Design a binder for this molecule. Sequence first.
Ligand SMILES: OC[C@H]1O[C@@H](O[C@H]2[C@H](O)[C@@H](O)[C@@H](O)O[C@@H]2CO)[C@H](O)[C@@H](O)[C@@H]1O
Ligand SMILES: OC[C@H]1O[C@@H](O[C@H]2[C@H](O)[C@@H](O)[C@H](O)O[C@@H]2CO)[C@H](O)[C@@H](O)[C@@H]1O
Ligand SMILES: *[C@@H]1O[C@H](CO)[C@@H](O)[C@H](O)[C@H]1NC(C)=O
Length: 398
Amino acid sequence: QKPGETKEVHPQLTTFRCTKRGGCKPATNFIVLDSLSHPIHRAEGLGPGGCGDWGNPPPKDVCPDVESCAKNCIMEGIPDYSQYGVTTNGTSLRLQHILPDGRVPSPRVYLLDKTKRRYEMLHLTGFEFTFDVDATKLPCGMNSALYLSEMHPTGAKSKYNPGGAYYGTGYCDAQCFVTPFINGLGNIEGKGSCCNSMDIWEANSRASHVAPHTCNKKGLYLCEGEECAFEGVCDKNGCGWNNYRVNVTDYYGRGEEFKVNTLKPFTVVTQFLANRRGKLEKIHRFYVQDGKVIESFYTNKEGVPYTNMIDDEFCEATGSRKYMELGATQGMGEALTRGMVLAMSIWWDQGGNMEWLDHGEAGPCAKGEGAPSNIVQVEPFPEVTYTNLRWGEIGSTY
Ligand SMILES: OC[C@H]1O[C@@H](O[C@H]2[C@H](O)[C@@H](O)[C@@H](O)O[C@@H]2CO)[C@H](O)[C@@H](O)[C@@H]1O
Ligand SMILES: OC[C@H]1O[C@@H](O[C@H]2[C@H](O)[C@@H](O)[C@H](O)O[C@@H]2CO)[C@H](O)[C@@H](O)[C@@H]1O
Ligand SMILES: *[C@@H]1O[C@H](CO)[C@@H](O)[C@H](O)[C@H]1NC(C)=O
C-alpha cells in the first residue's frame, strides 16, 4: 500500500553483539509494527474503509489488480507507537496486549537496522541469541513470542511497495496465512505467505516452548491451494520442545518450586550448534536467574530419546513429520545461515485457547482456562517485556 502523509516514528532499541574477547557491545536498532497493523485506508474521494481483513484478498472495488491497489490503498505512518502497546526504554521493549482503555492491539513488531530501511538480518547458525524477559503478566492462553522468519531484508521494497521495511512490509511465517497484502503488494489471488520460521520463544508464565519450523522453499513463497495446507510447503506444527511434553514438571512455572521461577525476571539463552561442516545439528536452550545458570532439563519420557537438545533424532521420534520432510535441522540451519528477521509479538487464541502451549501434554492450564474471556478475568492487561537482546559467540552472551 502507498505510504500516507503521517510520519512513522520508530521506537529505538539498544541491543548487543557479543564475543568472548570483547563481551557484549551496544548497537542501535529500531522497532517497526507490521505493515497491516498501520492504519490502512483508501485514496482521496474513495470513501471510508480499509483494503481488506486478515485471511482474505483485498477488495476488488479498489484492488482489481496490483497496480490499482498500490494507488488506491494508503498506509499511514504511526507517530506514537504507545497507541499500539509498543514502547521502548533503552534496552527494554514492552509489548502490551490490552491497553487501559480496552483496545487490544496485540502488537507484532520487527527489528530494523540502524538505517530504518532494512531489517536487521540475524545469521545464527553456529552462534547464540539471548534475552532477558518478564513473563509475570502472561497467564494461561497468552503467547509472548520472539522468533525469526525468512522475510526479505527490505520488506521487498519495489515500485508498487515504496514503503518496504520502514513500514514493516513483507511478513511471512510457516503457517502460510492469507493476508490482503504480501510483500507490500495487493494479494489479488488470495495466496498464502509462507516462509521458514525459527520459534526461539513462545511462552507465558506457565509454559515455555521452542520450535523450528521448516519449509521446502527459500524466503517468502506465495502458496496456492494444497501448497498452503498441512501436506504443503511449510511445517505448521514445528518440532516442539517443552519440558511438560517430555515429562518434566518442575522446571518452569510460577513459584520457588520451579527451577525457572516465572514470578521473577530471567534470562533465556538459545545456542544453534553446528557440526564440523557448518550445518546446524542441535538447538540448546538454558536459562539464567538470580545470577545462576539453570541448565536445560533432559527428556524424561518413555519412547522419547534421552536428550537435552533439539535434534533430528528427537524430532523424528516425537512425530514431527513435516519438520523432517521439509528440511530437518540442516534445512532450518540453512535458512538461519542465509539470514532471518527478528519478530516479537503478544497474542491470544479465540479458537483454540492456545492449548498446544500450556494445556494437557504442554502444561498445567485447565480446559477453558486459556480462553480470552477468562484471560481478562485473571490478568486484565497482559504484557511482556524483552530486555538486553544480544547475540554472538557461543558462551559470550551470559
Ligand atoms: O496465529 C496468529 C499469530 O501468529 C503469530 O506468529 C506465529 C506464527 O504464525 C507461527 O508459524 C510460529 O512461527 O509462531 C509465531 C509466533 O507465535 C504472530 O506473531 C501473531 O501476531 C499472530 O496473531
Ligand atoms: O497457528 C497456531 C499455532 O499452531 C501451533 O501448532 C499446534 C497446532 O495449532 C495444533 O493443532 C497441533 O495439534 O499442535 C501443534 C503443536 O504441535 C504452532 O506450533 C504455533 O507456532 C502456531 O502459532
Ligand atoms: C514421568 O516422570 C516420572 C518422574 O520422573 C517417572 O516416574 C515416570 O515413569 C515418567 N513417565 C513416563 C511415561 O516416562
